Amino acid sequence: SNAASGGRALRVLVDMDGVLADFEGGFLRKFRARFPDQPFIALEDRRGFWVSEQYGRLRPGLSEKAISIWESKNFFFELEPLPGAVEAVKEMASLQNTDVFICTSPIKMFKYCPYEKYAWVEKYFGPDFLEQIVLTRDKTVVSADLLIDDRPDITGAEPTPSWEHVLFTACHNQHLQLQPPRRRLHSWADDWKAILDSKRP
Amino acid sequence: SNAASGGRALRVLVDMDGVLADFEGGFLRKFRARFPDQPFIALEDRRGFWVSEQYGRLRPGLSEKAISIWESKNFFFELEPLPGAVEAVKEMASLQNTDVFICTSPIKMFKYCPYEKYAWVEKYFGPDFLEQIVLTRDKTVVSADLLIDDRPDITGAEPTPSWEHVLFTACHNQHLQLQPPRRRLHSWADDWKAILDSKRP
Ligand SMILES: [K+]
Ligand SMILES: [K+]
Ligand SMILES: [Mg+2]
Ligand SMILES: [Mg+2]
């Protein structure tokens, strides 16, 4: 909930793919269904942020096939929420002196992805939550106290972002050793309120 | 053009509707075409940011008719650029130590507007410029040195935005007296480089 007039709420950016929406599982399911005769990467064997790069090393032309899954209509809209995500973000947004924004990067092909991300937020959070969406390829130019995001390397035009990046665990990042004092949120069952509270006055 | 590694470019947020794209003229044309038997507001007589509010005072039900124009498919995509806008932003983006982002708010109905704004940027600036789009209802959480925007009142969750808001003249704001030291960019023919340079080190 917003701070009282001109006052200062804790601001939390919550990433979408890999934090709210199960991109990795949705991708794998639809890849295997569309391309049943191709090899695939089990989630436990995922390494590195870019799915298409790992697929492209697996077999010639597989990068392009992988891309064709997330460029397809309904890919983003049909993603399942991660366990606990919707419930946690609803709770978070209801907290005193706490403003939550969903900060998400679209893919390069824009026919469906922006639209379906708005539709997905409406679906799980309601029409009023649409006001909290920030769609951007560069998250460093969005100011906040925290960014909860599964991407390990979050860079852009601002060399010194205002947020602390807390790495949300995903299959592709779970083995990564981070430079102290970087930290993780391991799942939505993990203690996200303690992380928020550590940044409060 | 981006600064050299870890260095600091001037950052400019350029608004879309009313600064790059002629929303007011496109609206009026399509309103008169669809609703030829209704009264309308000539651009010279436009007052206040919200078109639908002025229309709703003109005649019962006209707010809803007005809204139906910008909720329609192709409304955003077909907007004409303002004179000099595309050329100025291309030049601006090519300047040393200058990063340009297009910072735009979608309407509430999201079926077409996000998509068509991306398509419009691709059209006039090319595919690589899509990386510079930030879609948000709250511009105060986007950090920059400048925000060039026709909306007089730009508020949100951040009580002290990092940018200076320079008001871009539009029909609906041209008579407004601003509190010193607020300033204007009167059109793209006006001296936008001097405004940028005033914020440089
Ligand atoms: K990071
Ligand atoms: K303002
Ligand atoms: Mg993510
Ligand atoms: Mg505008």
Distance CA A55, CA A76 (A): 20
Distance CA B158, CA B146 (A): 15
Distance CA B138, CA A119 (A): 19
How was this model experimentally determined? X-ray
Torsion angle (degrees, nearest 10) of CA B45, B51, B53, B56: 80
The SS3 assignment for A10 reads: strand
Q: Work out whether the CA dihedral A69, A72, A78, A82 comes out positive or negative.
A: positive
Q: Is A149 annotated as a binding residue?
A: no
Which resolution in angstroms does this entry have? 1.4
| Numbers of helices and strands, H then E, in chain A | 6, 6
**What is the CATH code for B8-22+78-201?**
3.40.50.1000
Helix (H) or strand (E) holding B70: helix B62-70
Please, which residues bridge with residue A168 across strands?
Answer: A185
Task: Find the CB nearest B157 among A9, A110, A114.
Answer: A9
User: Which residue in this structure is represented by tokens 């909290």?
Assistant: A132
**Edge-to-edge, what's the strand order for the sheet holding B133-136?**
A183-185, A164-168, A146-149, A10-14, A98-104, A133-136, B133-136, B98-104, B10-14, B146-149, B164-168, B183-185
The SS3 assignment for B157 reads: coil
- CB atoms B136 and A138 under 8 Å: no
Q: What's the token pair of residue A20?
A: 């709210």
- CB atoms A99 and B157 under 8 Å: yes
Which of B170, B171, B173, B153 lies closest to B161, judged by CA?
Answer: B153
Distance CA B56, CA B54 (A): 5
Give the CA distances from residue A20 to residues A17, A43, A116, B93, in Å, rounded to whole numbers and listed in that order. Answer: 6, 17, 14, 34
Distance CA B87, CA B191 (A): 13
Using DSSP bridges, classify how beta strands B133-136 and A133-136 pair: parallel, antiparallel or unpaired.
antiparallel
Q: What's the token pair of residue B36?
A: 């030829």
Q: Is A139 annotated as a binding residue?
A: yes
Ligand 1 centroid to residue B61 C-alpha, Å = 50
Give the CA distances from residue B188 to residues A19, B71, B140, B159, B176, in Å, rounded to whole numbers and listed in that order. Answer: 41, 28, 23, 29, 19
Å between A53 CA and nearest CA of chain B: 20
The angle formed by the CA atoms of residues A108, A110 and A116, to the nearest 5 degrees, is: 120
Burial level of B166, CB count in 10 A (0-12/13-18/19+)? buried
CATH of B23-77, one of 1.10.3720.10, 1.10.40.40, 3.30.465.10, 3.30.420.40: 1.10.40.40
Specify whether the CB–CB gap between B125 and B104 falls below 8 A. Answer: no
Distance CA B100, CA B129 (A): 9
DSSP per residue over A140-164, as a string?
Answer: TTB--SEEEES-S----S-SS-SSE
- CB atoms B157 and A118 under 8 Å: no
Which of B135, B50, B98, B146 lies closest to A113, judged by CA?
Answer: B135
Chain A hits for B127, CB-CB cut-off 8 Å, are 108
Q: How far is CA A175 from the centre of its chain?
A: 18
Residue type, A35: F
- CB atoms A8 and B159 under 8 Å: yes
- Find the catalytic residue in A15, A22, A99, A149: A15
Beta strand residue intervals within chain A, DSSP E: 10-14, 98-104, 133-136, 146-149, 164-168, 183-185
What are the domain boundaries of chain B?
8-22+78-201, 23-77
